[PDB]
Amino acid sequence: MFENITAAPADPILGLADLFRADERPGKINLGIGVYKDETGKTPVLTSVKKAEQYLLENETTKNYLGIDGIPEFGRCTQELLFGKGSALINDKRARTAQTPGGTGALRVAADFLAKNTSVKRVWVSNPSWPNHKSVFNSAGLEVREYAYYDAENHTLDFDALINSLNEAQAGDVVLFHGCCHAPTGIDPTLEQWQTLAQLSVEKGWLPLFDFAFQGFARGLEEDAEGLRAFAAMHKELIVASSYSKNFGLYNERVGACTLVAADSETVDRAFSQMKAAIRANYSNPPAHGASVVATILSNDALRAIWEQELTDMRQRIQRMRQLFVNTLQEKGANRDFSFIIKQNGMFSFSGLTKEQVLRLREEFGVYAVASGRVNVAGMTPDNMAPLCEAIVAVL
Amino acid sequence: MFENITAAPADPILGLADLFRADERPGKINLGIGVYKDETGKTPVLTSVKKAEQYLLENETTKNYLGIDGIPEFGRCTQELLFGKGSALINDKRARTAQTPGGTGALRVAADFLAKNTSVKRVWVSNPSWPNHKSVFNSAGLEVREYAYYDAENHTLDFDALINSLNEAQAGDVVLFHGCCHAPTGIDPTLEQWQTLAQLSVEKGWLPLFDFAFQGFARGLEEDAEGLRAFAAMHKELIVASSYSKNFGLYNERVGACTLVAADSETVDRAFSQMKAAIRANYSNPPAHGASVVATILSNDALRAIWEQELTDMRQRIQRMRQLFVNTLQEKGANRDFSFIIKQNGMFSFSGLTKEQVLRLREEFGVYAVASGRVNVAGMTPDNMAPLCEAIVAVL
Ligand SMILES: *Cc1c(COP(=O)(O)O)cnc(C)c1O
Numbered sequence: 001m002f003e004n005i006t007a008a009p010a011d012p013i014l015g016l017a018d019l020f021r022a023d024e025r026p027g028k029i030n031l032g033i034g035v036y037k038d039e040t041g042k043t044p045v046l047t048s049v050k051k052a053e054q055y056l057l058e059n060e061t062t063k064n065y066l067g068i069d070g071i072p073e074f075g076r077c078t079q080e081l082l083f084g085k086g087s088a089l090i091n092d093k094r095a096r097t098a099q100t101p102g103g104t105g106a107l108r109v110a111a112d113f114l115a116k117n118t119s120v121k122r123v124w125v126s127n128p129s130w131p132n133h134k135s136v137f138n139s140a141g142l143e144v145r146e147y148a149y150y151d152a153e154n155h156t157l158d159f160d161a162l163i164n165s166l167n168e169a170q171a172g173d174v175v176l177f178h179g180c181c182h183a184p185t186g187i188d189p190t191l192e193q194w195q196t197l198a199q200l201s202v203e204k205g206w207l208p209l210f211d212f213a214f215q216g217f218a219r220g221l222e223e224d225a226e227g228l229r230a231f232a233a234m235h236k237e238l239i240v241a242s243s244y245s246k247n248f249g250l251y252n253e254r255v256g257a258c259t260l261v262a263a264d265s266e267t268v269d270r271a272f273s274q275m276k277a278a279i280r281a282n283y284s285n286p287p288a289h290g291a292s293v294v295a296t297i298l299s300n301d302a303l304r305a306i307w308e309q310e311l312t313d314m315r316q317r318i319q320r321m322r323q324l325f326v327n328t329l330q331e332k333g334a335n336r337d338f339s340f341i342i343k344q345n346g347m348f349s350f351s352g353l354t355k356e357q358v359l360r361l362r363e364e365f366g367v368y369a370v371a372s373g374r375v376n377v378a379g380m381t382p383d384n385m386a387p388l389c390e391a392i393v394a395v396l
Numbered sequence: 397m398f399e400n401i402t403a404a405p406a407d408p409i410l411g412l413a414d415l416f417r418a419d420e421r422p423g424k425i426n427l428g429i430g431v432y433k434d435e436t437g438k439t440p441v442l443t444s445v446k447k448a449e450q451y452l453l454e455n456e457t458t459k460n461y462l463g464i465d466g467i468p469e470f471g472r473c474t475q476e477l478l479f480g481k482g483s484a485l486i487n488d489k490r491a492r493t494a495q496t497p498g499g500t501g502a503l504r505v506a507a508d509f510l511a512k513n514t515s516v517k518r519v520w521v522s523n524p525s526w527p528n529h530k531s532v533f534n535s536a537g538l539e540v541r542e543y544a545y546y547d548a549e550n551h552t553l554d555f556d557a558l559i560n561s562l563n564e565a566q567a568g569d570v571v572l573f574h575g576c577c578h579a580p581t582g583i584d585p586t587l588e589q590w591q592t593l594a595q596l597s598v599e600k601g602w603l604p605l606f607d608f609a610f611q612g613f614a615r616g617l618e619e620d621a622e623g624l625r626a627f628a629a630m631h632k633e634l635i636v637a638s639s640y641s642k643n644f645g646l647y648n649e650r651v652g653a654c655t656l657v658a659a660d661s662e663t664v665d666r667a668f669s670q671m672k673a674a675i676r677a678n679y680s681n682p683p684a685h686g687a688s689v690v691a692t693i694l695s696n697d698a699l700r701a702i703w704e705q706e707l708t709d710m711r712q713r714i715q716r717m718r719q720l721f722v723n724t725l726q727e728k729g730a731n732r733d734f735s736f737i738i739k740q741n742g743m744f745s746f747s748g749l750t751k752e753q754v755l756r757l758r759e760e761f762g763v764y765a766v767a768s769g770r771v772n773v774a775g776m777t778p779d780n781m782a783p784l785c786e787a788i789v790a791v792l
C-alpha cells in the first residue's frame with residue numbers, strides 16, 4: 001500500500017539546519033534559523049514564562065480537556081491584544097477566538113472552515129510570503145494565487161503592482177495579509193497604505209485573512225496592530241490567525257489563535273460553531289500548557305510587566321543588529337547600500353544576495369543563509385558581526 | 397460571506413455536560429463524562445506527571461520548536477509500549493512514530509496521509525465506535541463504512557456478523573480497530589479472535605488502522621497490546637494511532653502518536669516523509685509539554701514505577717465499580733442481568749437502557765447518561781452507587 005509512495009521534498013530550510021550542524025568550522029553562523037536568539041545565540045525561555053509555569057505547577061489540579069476553543073481567558077486576552085482593549089468588535093461581541101496549536105494550526109483551521117463552509121476557492125498570498133502558506137491552503141482545497149509585493153530594485157513595498165495584481169481577485173476571494181513584520185521581507189505597509197488597502201478591500205469584496213505572528217516585534221504591541229485595526233474598523237468580516245510562538249518564545253508549546261469576525265454576534269456564533277466542528281475533525285481540543293502560560297502572564301500585572309520588558313528587549317536587540325549590521329558592512333566596505341536593512345522590521349529581510357553568493361558564503365565561509373538571500377537578523381551577535389560582514393564583503 | 401452559514405449540530409455528548417451542570421439537584425450523577433474520575437469524583441493530575449513537570453520546570457532551557465515528529469525519546473518509548481521492548485518491527489526499524497496532538501490528531505494525520513498518498517477511499521469503522529471517527533475521515537475525504545460488531549441480545553462480540561460484513565471491504569480498504577477497551581462497548585476480541593482477524597486481514601488486503609487510546613485499562617500494558625501485536629506479526633503495513641490522554645491523565649496536553657509500519661525501513665522512511673508533509677500542512681510540529689512529561693516518566697525507572705502503580709490503581713477502580721455496580725443492582729433488585737458488565741473492559745459499556753429510560757433517568761432522578769445507554773463506569777463512586785442503582789431500578 002506504501003511501496004510506491006513518493007518521498008516528500010527536502011524541507012526548503014531544514015536542510016540548512018542539518019547541513020550547518022555538520023560543519024566542524026566553529027566560526028560558522030546560521031542566518032537561516034527562523035527563530036529568535038539572544039546575544040548568547042540562545043533561544044531561552046522567558047523569565048515571565050518560567051514564573052507562569054511555576055505558578056501552573058503549583059496550582060493545576062486536573063489536566064482534563066479544554067473546550068474546542070481552548071481556555072477562555074486566553075481568547076479574551078488575545079482579542080484585546082489584537083483589536084485593543086476598548087474595541088467595538090469586542091463590545092459588540094462580533095469576534096470569536098479559538099485557541100489553536102500555533103499560528104499554523106490557526107491557518108489550517110481557517111482554511112478548513114472556509115473550504116467546507118463558504119464559496120471561497122482561492123487565497124491570495126503575497127509573493128514572497130512565509131513558505132508553509134501554500135501547503136496549508138492547498139491541503140484544505142483552496143487554490144493559492146499570489147499578489148505582487150516586493151520591489152527588488154528599491155527593496156521596498158511595490159504598492160502599485162500590489163494593488164494592481166489584487167485586481168484579478170474576485171469578490172469572495174480571500175486575501176492574506178501579514179499584520180506586521182512581513183516575512184520574509186520585513187517591509188510593512190505604512191498606516192496610510194493599510195487604510196487604502198482596507199478601502200479597496202471593502203470595495204472589491206475580499207475576505208481579509210491576517211497572519212499575525214510577530215506582534216510587538218516592529219514598534220510595539222499596539223502600533224503593530226494598527227493595520228489590522230485599520231481593516232477591522234472597515235470590515236464586517238475578517239479572520240486573524242495569531243501566533244505567540246515568537247513574542248512569548250513558546251515555539252514548541254504550539255500556542256496560537258484563530259479569531260473570526262462577523263457582522264453581529266449571532267452570525268459570528270453560527271460561523272464559529274462550524275469552525276469548532278472543523279477543530280473537532282482535526283485535533284479535537286487544543287494543548288493547554290502554552291496557552292495557559294500566555295493567559296496567566298497577560299492577565300497578571302506583574303508578570304505582564306516583565307514580559308513586555310522582555311519583548312521590547314527582544315525587539316530592540318533585533319533593531320540593534322540591523323543597525324550594527326548596516327554600518328559594520330560600511331566599515332568592512334563594499335559598493336553597497338544595505339540601508340534598506342534599517343528600514344525593515346522584524347527578524348527577516350532579503351539581504352539581496354544572489355543564490356551563487358549565498359552558496360559560496362556557506363561553502364567558503366561557513367555563513368548559512370536561505371538561497372533566496374533571506375537572512376535572520378536575530379542570528380547575528382555583536383561577536384559574530386565582524387566575520388559575518390567580512391564574509392559578506394568577500395563575496396560581493 | 398458567513399451570513400448563510402448553517403450552525404454546527406449540538407455536540408452529541410457535550411450537551412449533557414451543560415445540561416447536567418444546571419441541575420440544582422446535588423444527588424445528580426453524570427455518567428456521560430467520557431473521562432476518568434477517582435473515588436472523589438475528580439480527574440486529578442497523576443503524582444508521576446507532577447514530578448515529571450517539576451523536573452521539566454527545573455531543567456528546560458528553551459521552548460524552541462520540536463521536529464515535525466516530536467521528541468524522539470517519546471517516539472521510541474511509544475513503539476516499545478505498542479510492539480514490546482524486543483519487537484522485530486523495532487529492530488528491523490520498519491516503524492516510524494510521529495508525536496501528535498492527542499489520539500484524534502493522530503487519526504487525522506493518518507487520514508490526510510492516506511488520502512493524499514494512497515488509493516484508499518473508504519474506512520471501515522465498527523458500529524458502534526468512538527463518535528468523532530466519521531468526521532475525521534470524511535474531513536480528509538475518506539468514505540466511512542461500518543462493519544458489524546455488537547450483539548444487542550447477548551451483549552457480546554458478534555464475531556460472525558463482524559467477519560461477515562467485513563467481506564464487503566475490498567483490498568486496499570482501511571479497517572479501523574480499537575486495540576483494547578472498545579468504545580463504547582467494552583467488548584474486545586479475545587486473542588484467538590484477534591489472530592483469526594489478522595489472518596483474514598492479510599488475505600483480504602485490508603490496511604489495519606489501530607485506535608489505541610486505552611492501553612493499560614483492560615488487563616495491563618503488555619496484555620492490552622497483544623491484539624495489535626497479533627496483527628503486527630502478520631502485516632507488512634499497519635498504522636496505529638495511540639493516545640496518552642487517558643492512561644496518563646493528560647487529556648488537555650494533547651499527547652498522542654501516529655505510528656506507521658511498512659515492509660522495510662526504506663519504505664517506512666519514504667511514506668513517513670509524506671506523513672510529515674501532512675503534519676506540516678496542518679499544525680506544523682507538535683506540543684512539547686505533554687509529550688515531554690510522558691517521555692520523562694517512561695524513561696525514568698522511579699517515575700515509571702509510580703505511574704504504572706497509578707495506572708493499575710485506575711484500572712482496578714474501574715473494575716471495582718463494574719463489580720460493585722452489578723451486585724448493588726442485584727441488591728436493589730430487578731429482573732436483570734447486568735453481568736455482562738463485569739465481562740467488559742474499560743470505562744464504557746452499554747447499560748442496555750432504552751432512550752426513554754435514560755431520559756427519565758436524567759429528568760426524574762438526575763442521572764445523566766448518553767441516549768445510547770452508554771455509561772461511564774468511572775463516574776460511579778462507592779458513595780453514589782446506591783442512589784444510582786435505585787434510580788436504575790425505578791426505571792426498568
Ligand atoms: C511563525 C509564523 C507563523 C506561525 O507559526 P507557528 O510556529 O505555527 O506559531 C505563521 N505565519 C508567519 C508569517 C510566521 O512567521
Ligand SMILES: *Cc1c(COP(=O)(O)O)cnc(C)c1O
Nearest residue numbers: 498499500526579607609639641
Ligand atoms: C480518547 C480516544 C481517542 C483519542 O482522543 P484524544 O483525546 O484526542 O487523545 C481516540 N479513540 C478513542 C476510541 C478514544 O477513546
